[PDB]
From a paper:
Tryptophan repressor (TrpR) was one of the earliest gene-regulatory proteins for which a high-resolution crystal structure was determined in complex with its DNA regulatory site. The TrpR dimer is formed from deeply intertwined monomers and is related to domain-swapped proteins, even though it does not meet a proposed definition predicated on the existence of a stably folded monomeric structure, which TrpR apparently does not have. Formation of the extended domain-swapped structure depends on the conversion of two interhelical turns in each subunit of native dimeric TrpR into helical segments, resulting in the formation of a continuous, nearly straight α-helix of 47 residues. TrpR crystals in the typical native dimeric form have previously been reported for a variant in which Val58 is replaced by isoleucine (Val58Ile), one of 19 TrpR mutants created by Arvidson et al. to explore the role of the identity of the residue at position 58, which forms part of the l-Trp-binding site.
Author numbering:
A (entry chain AA), B (entry chain AA): 22 to 129
Write the structure that this text describes.
């Protein structure tokens, strides 16, 4: 039995809600071009919904600075041990004349 | 006593929510220009909030066609009696030779 994936009612109401969302995105796009975006957003949204969107922008900003500041901390800490291992390896491969000279001038 | 119109806390939180709304409107404006509006709207809104905006566009459309269709009905009905009164006035001001001729050809 090849069962139908969805009903004809759900398929029609899915395309309807799809076209209604596209009409809104297109309506808001031309509003930004016709400089009517600010009054249109007041018609589409309540004052509380506008405050919610303004705070969500600050939420995703503080979430990005939270991930980025620790991403730079994970890279700065990881690169910190990289210069130490490079310093240890380059010190072993250094010639004897340079090594014994560094022990004399750096360690008095 | 010249009472202060609002508190310093309410004035600061009013400018904050004002700048957060402007940042959102500007963020969405550049998204439409950088062709990133569709993924940004999915980040800012839930699927239910997107369905709500898509239906509100159809609401304001059906509210406009409701007002417009009856506006045209109020104008078509008002202009209908205007042609009747013009027909009555123009018929009284018509000459006798035209009036008695219309009674002969239109009323057999």
């Amino acid at each position: 039995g090849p069962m139908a994936q969805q009903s004809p009612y759900s398929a029609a109401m899915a395309e309807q809600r799809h076209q209604e969302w596209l009409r809104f995105v297109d309506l808001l796009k031309n509003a930004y071009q016709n400089d009517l975006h600010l009054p249109l957003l007041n018609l589409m949204l309540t004052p509380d919904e506008r405050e919610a969107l303004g705070t969500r922008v600050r939420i995703v900003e503080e979430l990005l600075r939270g991930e980025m500041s620790q991403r730079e901390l994970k890279n700065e800490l990881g690169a910190g041990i990289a210069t130490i291992t490079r310093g240890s390896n380059s010190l072993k491969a250094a010639p004897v004349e340079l090594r014994q000279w560094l022990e004399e001038v750096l360690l008095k």
